[PDB]
Amino acid sequence: RKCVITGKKTTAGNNRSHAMNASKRTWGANLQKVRILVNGKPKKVYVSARALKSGKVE
Amino acid sequence: MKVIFLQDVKGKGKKGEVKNVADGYAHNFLIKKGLAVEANASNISALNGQKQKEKKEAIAELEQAKSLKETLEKLTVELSAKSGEGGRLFGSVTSKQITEQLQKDHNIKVDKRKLELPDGIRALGYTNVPVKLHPEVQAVLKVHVKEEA
RNA sequence: GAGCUGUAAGCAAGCUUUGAUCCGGAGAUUUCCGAAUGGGGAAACCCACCACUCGUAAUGGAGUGGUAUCCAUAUCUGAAUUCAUAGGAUAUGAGAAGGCAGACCCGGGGAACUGAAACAUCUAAGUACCCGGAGGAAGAGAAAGCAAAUGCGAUUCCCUGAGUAGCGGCGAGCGAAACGGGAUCAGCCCAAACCAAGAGGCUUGCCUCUUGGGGUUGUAGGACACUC
RNA sequence: GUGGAUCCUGAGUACGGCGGAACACGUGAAAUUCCGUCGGAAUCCGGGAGGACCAUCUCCCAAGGCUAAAUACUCCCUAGU
RNA sequence: AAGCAGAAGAUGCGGAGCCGCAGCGAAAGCGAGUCUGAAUAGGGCGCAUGAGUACGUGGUCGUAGACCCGAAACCAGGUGAUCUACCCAUGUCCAGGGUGAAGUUCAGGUAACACUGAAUGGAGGCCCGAACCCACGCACGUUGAAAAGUGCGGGGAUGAGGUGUGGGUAGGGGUGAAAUGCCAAUCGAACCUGGAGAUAGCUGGUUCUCUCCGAAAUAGCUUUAGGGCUAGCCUCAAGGUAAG
RNA sequence: CGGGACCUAAGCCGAGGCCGAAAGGCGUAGGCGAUGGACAACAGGUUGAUAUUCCUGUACCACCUCCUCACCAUUUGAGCA
RNA sequence: AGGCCCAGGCGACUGUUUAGCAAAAACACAGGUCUCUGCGAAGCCGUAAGGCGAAGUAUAGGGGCUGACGCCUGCCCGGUG
RNA sequence: GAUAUUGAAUGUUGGUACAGCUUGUACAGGAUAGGUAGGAGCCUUGGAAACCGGAGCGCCAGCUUCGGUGGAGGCAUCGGUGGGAUACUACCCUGGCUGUAUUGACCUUCUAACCCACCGCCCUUAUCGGGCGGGGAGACAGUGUCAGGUGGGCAGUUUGACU
RNA sequence: GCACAAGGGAGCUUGACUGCGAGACCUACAAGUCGAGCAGGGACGAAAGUCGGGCUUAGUGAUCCGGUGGUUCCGCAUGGA
């Protein structure tokens, strides 16, 4: 589960609430399963939104 | 993102109506329908080239046409047609007769619609025939008719 | 260079000065399982297909080789769908899976007991553990750096700085850097701009697409013109 | 080596708001860096840093890549303590 | 010091670096003065009554497990449904006797089936009772034959039934006709290895001899009362020295 | 004869594939998996240990001709499934 | 190979349970009742796929309370859902 | 709930690039005076005076305007006012409106993406998925971020001493 | 303990001041209490002389962290902040 174009994957980190508790948390990626012609043909794979805007064609 | 429209958005925009078109919807619709094309350096340069080419073509087409057309139109042309007593002409030389005259005499090759004459000359004299050489420029043709035999 | 066919007594029988046993260098062979790879599998078990060979009058049977998956190149096919693709078939592939040493290291996850005489921030600690990769070392590395002087010039590691600054329920506790002195010593290529050739698109006289020539810097450098 | 007619010097990136992590640094005035979202620059007449920030000054050209040497370890081998 | 040459050494180079000789003030800063202060005033800290530095022995302290043994417990990674709980697929077992439903046929009988009586009937989480299963009342055993039994009697025994084989549910969990029950003789949170030599203001132990001196069980504080700091009491060394 | 060169349930494995920090989980095709289904031997003796396996008789199941035989057919053409 | 009778309490009954102290008045049971759910049901397992519900479709499936059969479940919606 | 995935309209309320212009008195006064320069002149059949309706303003003084009937004269330096003179160029935003394109938001209908646990074909002996073709909704939902409310379902803890 | 008023009253005033402070009590520590006297301005009083809170003992709790006013202070190169 990562963007095929760039190395964008699910990262991890803490979740500091009031009193600075240290509950563990995960950070996802805003990626969608849209059609892109990464190869000679379209494949409908995951791709990051940040990379989708003004980037590779759909 | 910016696009080079190929057809109407709110009216035919083949001239490249550069705009901002909601990149998502822009891509989806314009690409699925071919309504436009990406506004990159290559496509922009191609559009500019095609546009300047057609502009110069039209400019030349109008320039070459107006000049000699008017210059020659400033000449005198004459023909002959029988007439009766009392000046009652036996016929009338319409635009078709004048077109045939200019085609067989001077070889001007002007369309019968571009050169029109509704009054239907019935007089045995001289007359100036305006012409729609250009939507903004026009010239007259000094036509003449005289008795025959 | 004269005892030796082990530990291990032997009982028996044999090899050795044409040179044994023995020592070292390079080789042959290496049943089955095992990443195990033809299929299955209760590890060392069972069952096959295609070729060559043995044998029977035939089956039946037996010996050698090939027959997993992923990935790269190429060839033939190539449905919905008309071309075309997905997909299928074939040949090349010291390519690759697995542990290893209970160690060193790069990164992703990631605790609690404990201490604070309780305890939640904090400490424990990015420790243990788990995961993926290689090397003999790995990481880093030639300043968009330090530094504030008639200034040093890639990283790395050692002594100092220093338990000083600073951080901290300003608690417990945590903890530097640079200068300085040392061990070593090496700096280099690409993109960009421009130019030669060709290809496709006609961006129709313009555009990018590929190999090559090119140049790499902050006293700014390169292209361009020229001197070399 | 000479000139600044003209061109280039690494973009969805440097950074910014939001929620985190590591830098001795616990969000504190918090520089610098990495992260996941959105916004988004100049490009030499330019840009970054000097522990918030601004002007002068000083140093350097990031968003491309490689680099042995001094460094850590021993499962094992040879010799010796 | 690092480091260089040197037998893993001593030695030589290496003054990079640290401490003292000047202190005061938070700091600018001043300087045997300085700070405070309006102020030659007064007072705080110092000199004038200079001695520190580097090694080695010993006492003590702080960080490492830190005096030796001792937990219950916590986290991470793994093994377990061959016992037991439930579920799934497929087989197997229930000797004998009794009861007698619905229904069906016939007879009576009503205008008509309603209704009654005879014949077959063999349903039942039916009855009594073997194998099998569960243990409920009592005795023996409790260093037993057995880390949960035996002897007598007891309940169910054709439907919520017992049982063989194979398979699934693995702990911050599963299962449970539900008791805090079972999960390999361990379960209010299974077992193995690591963190880990966890921590323990708690108990126990702490190994040769002589000699000089010689206490306490008291005050304050304390998330503290069986703990800890200061003071009180003891000892060792150097000074004032005759103050007690 | 109990099982393998016969089939299959639960369940597991599982190309491709879908998911997910990694490790990995799910699952199509396909295949494993009897505790099921189909399958050809029975009756008398033998030794100290084996026996519906050895000996003595009668038999059965699957398959091929070196031969044997009768049938059809060699293209509305036998035969196989 | 049955001791029986009189009378009351508890539980409609048969069944299940604290292996290894308590077999019961405990649990469940058929029944009643309230509530949720219109089908990619709701609920549940799982980070997500993928699955149970269910090769079901409101007379069907889940959750709570009471437990056959005869009579009834009376008042209060101020407080909390 | 905001944002990316995720836009097209019909109307709609602000602001931009074009546009349309009007609001102005302390009194003195014939009055409604804001000034700074140019100022001895201007409109008049492309028509005075008067008349009436409507639009606007307002310190209710009144003015202006536009719609038009009626038609040959109105206005102005100069006479006086007071701090400052009335005809043409402008501004100070005191004052309200309409049109075109973007611009952002509000509330409306459509479809393009997104979905498919709806189908037909092929991949393919496949109830997985994935390409095509129809239909269903559709800027929704799902997904990643940020925030608010609920949350013993779950986790780490605390609950003093003298007596 | 106060009638020599510390208890009553009448006038003027704010010493209910600023820097200090020889030396003492109490105290494990922190802390608390008295204080003649010096200097700068004052009040009362002709003067002397008194006034650094109440006739005297309880009327109040630290550190850290925050807020307000004044500063010959410092301010990560320079000048500011």
What are the domain boundaries of chain A? 1-58
Residues of chain A found within 8 Å of residue B28, distances taken between Cβ atoms: 58
- Torsions phi, psi for B8 (to 5 deg): -65, 140
B19 touches chain A (CB under 8 A): no
How far apart CA B89 and CA B92 sit, in angstroms, is: 7
B1 touches chain A (CB under 8 A): yes
Structure-token pair, residue B21 = 């078109």
> Over A16-30, what HEC string results?
ECCCCCEEEEEECCC
Give the strand order in the sheet containing B19-20: B19-20, B2-5, B36-38
CA of A7 to C1' of C139 (A): 21
> Over chain A, what HEC string results?
CCCCCCCCCCEEEEEECCCCCEEEEEECCCEEEECCCCCCCCCCEEEEHHHHCCCCCC
Method: cryo-EM
Residues of chain B found within 8 Å of residue A57, distances taken between Cβ atoms: 27
Question: Inter-chain contact B23–A58, Cβ cutoff 8 Å?
Answer: no
Are the CB atoms for B64 and B130 separated by under 8 Å?
Answer: no
Q: Is the CB of A43 under 7 A from strand D?
A: no
> Which candidate, B15, B18, B14, B20, places its Cα nearest to that of B1?
B20
Distance from CA of A41 to the nearest CA of B (A): 16
**β-bridge partners, A43:** none
Question: Inter-chain contact A54–B31, Cβ cutoff 8 Å?
Answer: no
Distances (CA, A) of B149 to B6, B80, B82: 64, 9, 7
> Which candidate, A22, A26, A29, places its Cα nearest to that of A8?
A29
